[PDB]
């Protein structure tokens, strides 16, 4: 509910990166929160937004995205290169109980640390 | 800042204890840590490290029971010396409990 | 797999010794903590040359993967007590 | 890889529900694999399906979902009611390095367990 400075923990092939989010308000036209890490520059800043919805049915999205950078020798700035987007979409409807619900978000969650995304991802191998 | 390790001493081979950890104002949250205890030989045992917010669990090679278990609700933790790590990740740690 | 030699102390004026050596892989992460008989250790200098607050300028040590020497100071004061050497890679890490 | 029994662990609100998968095979017209529980009727069964793909640029899809039903009282056969849909899509380019890529992963996967996402999909609090 009330959003803070969400930290997370031991992340990214070896547990050994560690990573700290501070708020960066509501867009009050769509209601999406936003959550960025406190980088150097703003446009190299690793974002995070989530956004829960209101009916039809339910809708929650969670859109995250980190750039990377390398400095070009014509300019003294930092240019932004390539990105790598994701984003997670849960779609519930109106008489979906607790349980149920945390029944999806702990699934995925425990199946991304699975060793067939492991593979699915980090090698892009197919199944 | 300190934290304090809590448990029985009389076990019987067989059965099962559940040490309690209590912590003292680092928040709980934001900081990993891990168990290692002793022998009367030998100080640097095993690790069962936790992560931040329990999602990388890992045992050591002992593993049978001896399960790591986080709550955030009296800032304690609970398993069935009792130290942590710093703020950025890593694997060395530096407070500890009795 | 880590090993440091044998115990000793020599003098209470001199320098000593310790070497942590490891046959797994390199490392640039090695650290060292400190075991006085009454309470749970206490770190020192770990990922490398930091020497966080707390312990003297005295202390120090040097290496990188497979070798790794821990060295201190002639008229080092008294109250020994052992030292242990552990790492940050792969997870049982002793 | 090559796709087997992926099992998973302590699972959905308090850690006491585990849960297998077999594989169903690859659908040749698109490649998407698909994993399924050994439930009894196979109108309800947890189906989780992932899909790597070719170029452009890279694109990796995981689509979840879990249906519920009850017993209607006119019908002898349980008739299926409600679903809970959730998706992942991510996506990179040419140039991203192996560590760059798993890095997005974990922290998704991290960040799921947060205790901002366990107040925003158990309530559907807004932030």
Redesign the interface.
Known sequence: ???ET????????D?????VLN?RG?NPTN?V?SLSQAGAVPALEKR?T???SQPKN?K?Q?K?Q?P?ACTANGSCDPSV?????????????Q??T?????????????????????????????? | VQLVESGGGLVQPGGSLKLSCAASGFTFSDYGMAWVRQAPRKGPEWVAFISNLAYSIYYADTVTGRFTISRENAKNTLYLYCARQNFDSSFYFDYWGR | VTQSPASLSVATGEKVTIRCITSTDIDDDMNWYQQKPGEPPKLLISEGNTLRPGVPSRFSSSGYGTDFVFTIENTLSEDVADYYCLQSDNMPLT
């Open positions: 509910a009330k959003l969400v930290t997370l923990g031991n992340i990214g092939k547990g050994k990166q560690t990573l708020p509501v209601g929160a995070v989530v956004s829960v339910y929650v969670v995250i980190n990377t290169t390539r990105q790598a987007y994701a984003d997670v979409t849960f779609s519930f409807t008489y979906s607790d349980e149920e619900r945390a029944f999806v978000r702990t699934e995925l969650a425990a199946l991304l640390a699975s060793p067939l995304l492991i593979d699915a991802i980090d090698q892009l191998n197919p199944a």
